[PDB]
């Protein structure tokens, strides 16, 4: 029961016959998930976590790269993946649903494998991921460091349908989200107007909302979405909302989180992304690895 590093393995609901690329790679590189798991539980116990220095993230990343690599050289839709600890090791599961992802957690558990986590590669918005119980959750290695990305966990999901391209969000549900977000942000930022602006520059995946459906790459315009200023009170202005998406050569998913970046009297944030290690950090903030 001492924190260490070791080579994890993955389990999948993979089906041999399914030619779906994930199932093809999964079956080969993965083993059946254990049906009857299997949690121990602790309380009054406190452990130091750190979603920002977590070897588990690196392992998942390497597998997904290799996943896409083998894949590309048609069926495509990600599967919930599980990551398990070798005999001699276990995985601490922090149960404090208020955890900022860094520091001490006074309420932890013990499992061998992680929950089903779909490897969905995207930018600006995390999709099909898990939700935050209760309040909006806010995470960053260093807020004082505007250069470090900010991960915002959603406690209520928003549906999305990009198809052809164009995508759609419910205005009513979006503005609801952002006010509560500027609120949480206002908690971390005092006498400062919290503005939201589209990605200021850089690669096309990073400046638009990017993601892949059925094997097609969708790069969608985000200018309308990140166009709101929120002082004490709050109000988002933009042209339901529609975002123009480009294609390459229909899918309905749930938005569950955000990636923000602050600019160095006001504090404006923009959408980030790129390093998919955050998409992972988004789902592996709760896990940690110890040898017994």
């Amino acid at each position, epitope marked *: 029961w001492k924190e260490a590093k070791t080579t994890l393995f993955c389990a999948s609901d993979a089906k041999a016959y399914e030619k779906e690329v994930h199932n093809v790679w999964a079956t080969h590189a993965c083993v059946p998930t254990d049906p009857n798991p299997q949690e121990m539980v602790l309380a009054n116990v406190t452990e130091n976590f750190n979603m920002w220095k977590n070897d588990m993230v690196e392992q998942m990343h390497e597998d997904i790269i290799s996943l896409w690599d083998e894949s590309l050289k048609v069926s495509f839709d990600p599967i919930p993946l599980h990551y398990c600890a070798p005999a001699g090791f276990a995985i601490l599961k922090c149960n404090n649903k208020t955890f900022n992802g860094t520091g001490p957690c006074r309420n932890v558990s013990t499992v061998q494998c992680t929950h089903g986590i779909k490897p969905v590669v995207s930018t600006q918005l995390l999709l099909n991921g898990s939700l935050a119980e209760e309040e909006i959750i806010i995470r960053s290695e260093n807020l004082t460091n505007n250069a470090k990305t900010i991960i915002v966990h959603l406690n209520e999901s928003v549906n999305i349908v990009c198809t052809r391209a164009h995508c759609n969000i419910n205005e009513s549900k979006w503005n609801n989200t952002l006010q509560k977000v500027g609120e949480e942000l206002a908690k971390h930022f005092p006498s400062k107007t919290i503005k939201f602006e589209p990605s200021s520059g850089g690669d096309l995946e990073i400046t638009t909302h*990017s993601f892949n459906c059925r094997g097609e790459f969708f790069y969608c315009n985000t200018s309308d979405l990140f166009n709101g200023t929120y002082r004490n009170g709050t109000y988002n202005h933009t042209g339901t909302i529609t975002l123009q998406c480009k294609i390459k050569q229909t899918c309905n998913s749930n938005i569950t989180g955000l990636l923000l970046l602050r600019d160095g009297d006001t504090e404006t944030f923009r959408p980030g992304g790129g390093d998919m290690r955050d998409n992972w950090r988004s789902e592996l903030y709760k896990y940690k690895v110890v040898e017994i």
Partner: nanobody
Amino acid sequence: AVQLQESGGGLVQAGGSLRLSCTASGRISSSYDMGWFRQAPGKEREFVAAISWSGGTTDYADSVKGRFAISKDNAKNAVYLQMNSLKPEDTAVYYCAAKWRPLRYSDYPSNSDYYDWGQGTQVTVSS
């Protein structure tokens, strides 16, 4: 992920030339960018060159266009940096670096935000 190790750094008279080599111990997928950044003393980390791993498109920092040249060898999992007509300003630690861009729209390499790094190699230019 991929393991980066730069070499060939050194000390050279102004106007001189020098070649740096980065080698990835892991393996680079098709959707990768490989580039060079450098940090001069007292200053911050800037960009120098980038090459698409698959298509081999390049991009150079303006202060570099014409003098440096970035090349790859997929067989050896290696990227190289030929630096000619060196100036005292080119003095810095050079870092090989990489970036997994599976959602890249084009073969054009990036000039920003890399995710995987090397430990750096020393480059010093004497006036």
